[PDB]
Every structure is written in structure tokens, then in C-alpha cells.
Design a protein around this ligand. Structure first.
Ligand SMILES: *[C@@H]1O[C@H](CO)[C@@H](O[C@@H]2O[C@H](CO)[C@@H](O[C@@H]3O[C@H](CO[C@@H]4O[C@H](CO)[C@@H](O)[C@H](O)[C@@H]4O[C@@H]4O[C@H](CO)[C@@H](O[C@@H]5O[C@H](CO)[C@H](O)[C@H](O)[C@H]5O)[C@H](O)[C@H]4NC(C)=O)[C@@H](O)[C@H](O[C@H]4O[C@H](CO)[C@@H](O)[C@H](O)[C@@H]4O[C@@H]4O[C@H](CO)[C@@H](O)[C@H](O)[C@H]4NC(C)=O)[C@@H]3O)[C@H](O)[C@H]2NC(C)=O)[C@H](O)[C@H]1NC(C)=O
Ligand SMILES: *[C@@H]1O[C@H](CO)[C@@H](O[C@@H]2O[C@H](CO)[C@@H](O[C@@H]3O[C@H](CO[C@@H]4O[C@H](CO)[C@@H](O)[C@H](O)[C@@H]4O[C@@H]4O[C@H](CO)[C@@H](O[C@@H]5O[C@H](CO)[C@H](O)[C@H](O)[C@H]5O)[C@H](O)[C@H]4NC(C)=O)[C@@H](O)[C@H](O[C@H]4O[C@H](CO)[C@@H](O)[C@H](O)[C@@H]4O[C@@H]4O[C@H](CO)[C@@H](O)[C@H](O)[C@H]4NC(C)=O)[C@@H]3O)[C@H](O)[C@H]2NC(C)=O)[C@H](O)[C@H]1NC(C)=O
Lengths: 198, 209
């Protein structure tokens, strides 16, 4: 079977990064690939050499930023003697008017203050499509100890998520500034940032 | 590729309340017309059991048969980690197919439940977000609900559980209310049910100070 995968949200949002869609064929024979952008074939995909199994022969096309964002379809045609027919699979960005995320940072609960570590919460809601990236920072230094929930469909058809940054209570108590940064196509410069401290 | 088998656990609320009836459900799909009779065997920890209730087979529009067997589980067997095996046997099958399901393995851990008021920034809107952070729980089976004044608040969404760095789980539930209701001092509470809680239940309240 074939499996087609979109680029990483962050990759499509920053010119410096390289967005790519990825065809992952699975399950002794040889393979072929044809890539089409809105029908038109293009000839600049690169195959990751026929790697091993358990018991995948993966190709990778890079894409233009504004193409993906403008909704172009990316078709992956896979030829094989052993497969009944030449399988195809398409992917594209979710359709619909983009909506700007609203970002709110929330400090730890009074009641959490007893613990060794505390939870800094960044709420991000009202956004569409669900392609987004969230990061935390202090003094322009990345934090590592954070988790972000998947996007969840809200009643109005927009998405929300929460990000949770965990810190030693002393740092919070000291009064250091922590920033939730969010990247999304509907933000100005695809990026915003909200700060939190005591 | 013949018929396929899927095995579903009970609902987390069902295993936690004596009043409710937890079940495991074994679903067989893509059963042909040539060989439409299917047999179910059920085992709890390898020991066969005989009280499952199998629905009579339903034809689909694609000419497959879909048939389901329902085994009620005792609440304490599920919470005690018993394994439930469904064996599906069918004439058009290289061998019977077996699926096994149980509560996730590990030591249970009590949720910490913290309620969080709207950001100042959000107050400029017609509606605001009441947050329930629930963290530190294992396994991930949990139920979350919001109420105010004895009644269910219906406008809420809860994230799936997320695996935290310590191997415990967390989630957030977001309750959206009209701002007026928040400013008017109403008290809202976030109810959470999980095996590692006393009486499998706790409630935390939120109101404007
Ligand atoms: C022998 O062994 C083989 C190898 O094990 C085995 O192959 C296996 O086949 C599986 C199917 O049997 C197959 O499973 C699929 O999984 C998909 C999820 O994606 C994966 O997630 C796994 C972990 O979570 C990983 O194991 C996979 O690698 C993959 O993870 C992603 O990998 C991408 C590949 O590059 C990454 O993208 C790129 O990342 C790079 C960075 O490195 C760049 O950033 C780049 O820009 C990116 O493009 C990506 O990072 C990574 N992501 C994550 C999160 O880890 C599923 O999508 C798929 O499910 C869908 O189909 C099934 C039916 O097959 C269906 O049940 C399911 O519901 C899904 O249906 C789809 O649903 C959505 C709507 O919700 C719609 O799109 C459609 O309606 C519907 N589509 C279809 C087609 O039905 C599926 O489960 C797996 O790929 C493979 N195992 C591994 C380990 O690779 C082979 O089968 C064996 N053979 C035999 C005979 O046994
Ligand atoms: C002909 O037409 C048929 C119908 O039109 C069609 O049948 C369909 O076949 C599909 C596969 O071909 C089959 O797909 C699977 O669906 C599973 C999800 O379960 C369903 O979810 C759907 C939406 O989410 C619902 O629509 C379904 O009803 C069902 O949902 C659940 O049903 C349960 C049983 O009733 C409910 O639980 C019980 O609820 C009651 C209350 O009513 C009680 O509370 C009781 O206690 C409960 O037990 C449950 O509530 C309900 N949920 C919802 C939301 O409604 C998927 O599980 C499955 O995906 C998994 O397998 C695939 C690979 O096969 C894999 O890609 C995917 O990732 C999943 O992998 C699993 O992952 C876990 C870990 O994460 C592993 O542990 C597992 O090992 C791994 N599984 C495997 C096998 O490796 C898959 O998508 C579909 O359900 C079926 N539908 C019907 C109606 O039959 C048929 O195919 C057609 N034939 C053709 C075209 O030829």
C-alpha cells in the first residue's frame, strides 16, 4: 500500500525551511514513482534508496511554500509489477478560509503551587486549518520540557489546542519571563508570541 | 484478504460506576455470502466464557456481512487488568482470528486536577474560556465533564490524553461560556472520573474570585 504525507506546518511557513511531501510505499520487487502538481508532472523528486523491512521504498518531493499554501494537489503514482494496478494517492492543504489563532497564556493554578514543578499553559484557539506549530522560550532560549495537545475541532469549526510548559517552581517564583510562540499561515509574518511571568 | 476483526474496550465511565454496564465488543466485517456463518469464542485470561450475546448478522450494501458479539465485563475484572480475547472462526479463513484487549499495563496514578480562569486578554470577547487541566494520570482512560449549579454545561471540548515526559498522561478541557455569566460570579465545576481517584471521582470549581 501507498501512504502520502504532508509537510510539517512549520516548514511551509518559513522560507528558510524546506517543505516536503512524502510517499511511503510498504509491504522483493522493484518500484517506480510519478509526481504531479495539479495534473502537470514535474521531474525533481528524489527517492530515499530502497530501505529495509521487518518483515519501505520512500520517495520525497520538495515543494514550494506558496504552492502548498495555495492548495495545489500533489499526486503520487506508484508503478509495480506485483501490485494489481498502478496505485495513486493525492494530498493537499485543508480547504477553507484561514482563521487567525488567538493566543492566551495562563499561569499555574494557586493549587499547583505546592509542587516541585509547575505548569505554564498556552491556549491557542480559533484557528483554521489545523496546521500549526507551538514553541516555548525564555530569554531567547528554547525550553524543552513542554508538550502540546493535538488540535481539536471546536463547535464553530475552528480548532484549538493547549501547550503545557513545565518548569521548576523556583524559576517561576524568581519571576523569569516565558514566551509561547505560535506559527500559522493566518498570523502576520506567520508568527506571533505571547509572554508569561509572575 | 478475508473478513477482519476489531475489538473495542468499554467506555471509561462504565468501568468506574457500579450503576453502569461495561462491555467489550468484538466486530467482524467483510464476511462473504459464500461463507456467512461465523463463530465467536471468548476468553478472560485464557479461560473460556459463555455469556457473550451475539447479534444476528447484518448484510451491508457492499454485500459483506457485519456481525458483532458483546461481552459484559465485571468492573473489577477490567480494573484488575484481566485480558479479554475474542476468537473469530469462519469457513473462509486460513485460521481463526484472535484479538485481545485489556486495560493498559502499568501502575495507576492519581490525576491532579487544576482549574484555570480566562486570560485578561480574552475578556474583550463576548465569550470566554474556562480551562481544566488534568495531569499525572495513568492509565489514560478518563472522563471529564463540566457543570454549573447542578446542571451540565454543554459547550465544552476536551483534548485527547497526551503522554507526558514522565510517562503519565495529561489533557485540558475547555469550557466556553458567555462572558456575562463569568462576570456575574457563577460557579463552574470540572468533574473528572478515573480509577486512581477516591470513589473514582473529583470535582474542582472555578469562579471569578
Ligand atoms: C511490513 O512492514 C512494513 C513496515 O512496518 C509495513 O508498512 C506499514 O504499513 C502500515 C499499514 O499497514 C502503515 O500504517 C499507516 O500509518 C500512517 C501513519 O503515518 C505513520 O505513522 C507511524 C507512527 O505514528 C509511522 O510508523 C510511519 O512512518 C508514519 O509516520 C510518518 O512518516 C512520514 C513519512 O515520511 C513523515 O512525514 C515526513 O516527515 C519528514 C521528517 O522526517 C518531513 O518533515 C516531511 O515534510 C514529512 O512529509 C512523518 O513525520 C511521520 N508522522 C508521524 C506522526 O510519525 C496512516 O496514515 C495510515 O492510516 C491510514 O490508512 C489506514 C489504512 O491503511 C486507515 O486505517 C487509517 O484510518 C488511515 O486512513 C486515512 O484516514 C485519513 C483521515 O483521518 C484520510 O487520509 C483517509 O480517509 C484515509 N486514507 C487511507 C489511505 O485509508 C496507516 O495506518 C505504515 O506506514 C507502515 N509502517 C511503518 C512503520 O512505516 C507493511 O505493511 C508490512 N507488510 C505486511 C504485509 O505486513
Ligand atoms: C463494507 O461496508 C462496511 C461498512 O460500510 C465496511 O466496514 C468497515 O470496515 C472498516 C475496515 O475495513 C472498519 O474500520 C475500522 O474502524 C475502527 C474504528 O471503530 C469504528 O470507528 C468508526 C469511526 O471512528 C465508527 O464508524 C465505527 O462504528 C467504529 O466505532 C466504534 O464502534 C465500537 C463498537 O460498537 C464502539 O464501542 C462500543 O460502544 C458501545 C456503545 O454503543 C459501548 O460503549 C461498548 O462498551 C463499546 O465497546 C465505539 O464507541 C465506536 N466508536 C465511534 C467513534 O463510533 C478502527 O479501529 C480501525 O482502525 C484500526 O485498524 C486499522 C487497520 O485495520 C488501522 O489503520 C488503525 O490505525 C487502527 O489500528 C489499531 O490501532 C491500535 C492502537 O492505536 C492497535 O492496538 C490495533 O492493533 C490497530 N488495529 C489493527 C487491526 O491493527 C478501522 O478503521 C470499520 O469500522 C467498518 N465499519 C463498519 C460499519 O463495518 C467494510 O469495510 C466494507 N467493505 C468493503 C469496502 O469491502
Amino acid at each position: 500500500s501507498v501512504f502520502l504525507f504532508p509537510p510539517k506546518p512549520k516548514d511551509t511557513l518559513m522560507i528558510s525551511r524546506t517543505p516536503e511531501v512524502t510517499c511511503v510505499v510498504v509491504d522483493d520487487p522493484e518500484v517506480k514513482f510519478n509526481w504531479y502538481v495539479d495534473g502537470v508532472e514535474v521531474h525533481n523528486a528524489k527517492t530515499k534508496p530502497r530501505e529495509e523491512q521487518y518483515n519501505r521504498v520512500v520517495s520525497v518531493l520538495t515543494v514550494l511554500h506558496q504552492d502548498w499554501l495555495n492548495g495545489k494537489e500533489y499526486k503520487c503514482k506508484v508503478s509495480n509489477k506485483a501490485l494489481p494496478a498502478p496505485i495513486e494517492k493525492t494530498i493537499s492543504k485543508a480547504k477553507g478560509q484561514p482563521r487567525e489563532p488567538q493566543v492566551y497564556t495562563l499561569p499555574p493554578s494557586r493549587e499547583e503551587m505546592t509542587k516541585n514543578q509547575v505548569s505554564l499553559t498556552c491556549l491557542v484557539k480559533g484557528f483554521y486549518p489545523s496546521d500549526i506549530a507551538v514553541e516555548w522560550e525564555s530569554n531567547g532560549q528554547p525550553e524543552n520540557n513542554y508538550k502540546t495537545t493535538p488540535p481539536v475541532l471546536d463547535s464553530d469549526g475552528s480548532f484549538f489546542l493547549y501547550s503545557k510548559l513545565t518548569v521548576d517552581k523556583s524559576r517561576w517564583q524568581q519571576g523569569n519571563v516565558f514566551s509561547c510562540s505560535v506559527m500559522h499561515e493566518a498570523l502576520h509574518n506567520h508568527y506571533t508570541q505571547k509572554s508569561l511571568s509572575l
